[PDB]
């Protein structure tokens, strides 16, 4: 009956901080992947378990589009089997991931002259994230032997840190907007390609 709403994900004015990454469930629509695969805006279009162009000729039970901002040198963390602070503490993809990682440089929208900025990441966590898990807590992190009991102090750290997006940053430190499409075959396919 209708086309899937990728526009509101990819062209949103605002993107989430990675620790609070946004998820949009894509269901009951025909997905026209052509606008995406044939776009020139994306500096990364990395697909797992599917050729990017046979998407319009396959059906899936549920499609998710996850969106957030990270640094350019962190895009490589959005992949199975990664071990950096982004994969461990912010956004984790499974070994059996099927989908595409799409990213583009967003320096013109997400950086401002001063440093101090609003995009955050989680620095510490008691354990690593499970795949597709989200942690938005702000509990004080106990790095030492004594419980913090909600009190910030030495060895008791606030767990979120800001990215310092400045327009003059090198490309590896500039903000990138990322959309992760994940396609699962679990049940009846409600999202299908136009072929």
């Amino acid at each position, epitope marked *: 009956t209708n086309l899937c709403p990728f526009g509101e994900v990819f062209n949103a004015t605002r993107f989430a901080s990675v620790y609070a990454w946004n998820r949009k469930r894509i269901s009951n629509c025909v997905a026209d992947y052509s606008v995406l695969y044939n776009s020139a805006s994306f500096s990364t279009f990395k697909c797992y378990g599917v050729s990017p162009t046979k998407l319009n000729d396959l059906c899936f039970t549920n499609v998710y589009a996850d969106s957030f901002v990270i*640094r350019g*040198d*962190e895009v490589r*963390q959005i992949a199975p089997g990664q*071990t*950096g*602070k*982004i994969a*461990d*503490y912010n956004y984790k993809l499974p070994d059996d991931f099927t989908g595409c990682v799409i990213a583009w440089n967003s320096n013109n929208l997400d950086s401002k002259v001063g*440093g*101090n900025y609003n995009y955050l990441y989680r*620095l*510490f966590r008691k354990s690593n994230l499970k795949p597709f898990e989200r942690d938005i807590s702000t509990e004080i992190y106990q*790095a*030492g*032997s004594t419980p913090c009991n909600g009190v*910030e*102090g*030495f*060895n008791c*750290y*606030f767990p979120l*840190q*800001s990215y*310092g997006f*400045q327009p003059t*940053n*090198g490309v*590896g*430190y500039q903000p990138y907007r990322v959309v992760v499409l994940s396609f699962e075959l679990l049940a009846p396919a409600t999202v299908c390609g136009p072929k």
Partner: antibody, heavy 116, light 107 residues
Framework: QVQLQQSGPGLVKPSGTLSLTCAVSGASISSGDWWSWVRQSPGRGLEWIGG???????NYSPSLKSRVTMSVDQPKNQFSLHLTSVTAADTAVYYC?????????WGQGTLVTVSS | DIQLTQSPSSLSVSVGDRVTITCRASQAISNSLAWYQQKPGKAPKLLLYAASTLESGVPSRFSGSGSGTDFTLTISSLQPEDFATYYCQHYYSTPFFGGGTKVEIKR
């Protein structure tokens, strides 16, 4: 990246006061970070000196506490180290650093020579 | 205070060789352990923390493991630019830096 720009004279006479200032860019002093100083001299390796929270709470190496003072200036987004009654043993490269458990960003370092 | 010691204090290895550096804590420190690379004339650079979590932008040949008192830094394949002194540091209590492991290149 967060940039820590260090300033202050590198030559200090014995018994004088070492004074260094770190200017922070790309990050705000008003954060849950400990604005810290670490020094390095041959044989001693890296030595944590101390850190200061934007609230003014301080945590100093106990071997140096009596001689160490740190301060923060939020409107200028900077912080400072003062080390009094310096001896030859205080000759070192002094680094400022943003610390929250880890020292993730470092200044360029200032070579401090205690000499007459 | 809780202290750290590194072994070996210096090693000389060929380009492409696997490098294993040990950091031992005088008391258990959970996984509050980080590793730094310091090239000559430069500030230390953070490689790993929480024992095994890589800092953003750090090359994939570096990894860490360990919990409690025994920690390991691994360089899976040494490159010539990896000449440096490698330091461990814990943040379980008063921050403390290990003595450093000087990595030289044999050719």
């Amino acid at each position: 990246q967060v940039q820590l720009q260090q300033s202050g004279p590198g030559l200090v006479k014995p018994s004088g006061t070492l004074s260094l200032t770190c200017a922070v860019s790309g990050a705000s002093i008003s954060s849950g970070d400990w604005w810290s100083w670490v020094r390095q001299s041959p044989g001693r390796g890296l030595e944590w000196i101390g850190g200061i929270f934007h609230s003014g709470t301080t945590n100093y190496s106990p071997s140096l506490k009596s001689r160490v003072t740190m301060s923060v200036d939020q409107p200028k987004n900077q912080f400072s180290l003062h080390l009094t009654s310096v001896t030859a043993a205080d000759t070192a490269v002094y680094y400022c650093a943003r610390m929250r458990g880890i020292f993730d960003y470092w200044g360029q370092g200032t070579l401090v020579t205690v000499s007459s | 205070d809780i202290q750290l010691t590194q072994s070996p204090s210096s090693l000389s290895v060929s380009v492409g060789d696997r490098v294993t550096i040990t950091c031992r804590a005088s008391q258990a420190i959970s996984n509050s352990l980080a590793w730094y690379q310091q090239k000559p004339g430069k500030a230390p650079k953070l490689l790993l923390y929480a024992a095994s979590t890589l800092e953003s932008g750090v090359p994939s040949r570096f990894s860490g493991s360990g919990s409690g008192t025994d920690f390991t830094l691994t360089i899976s394949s040494l490159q010539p630019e990896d000449f440096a002194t490698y330091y461990c540091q814990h943040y379980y209590s008063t921050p403390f830096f290990g003595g450093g492991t000087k990595v030289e290149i044999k050719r």
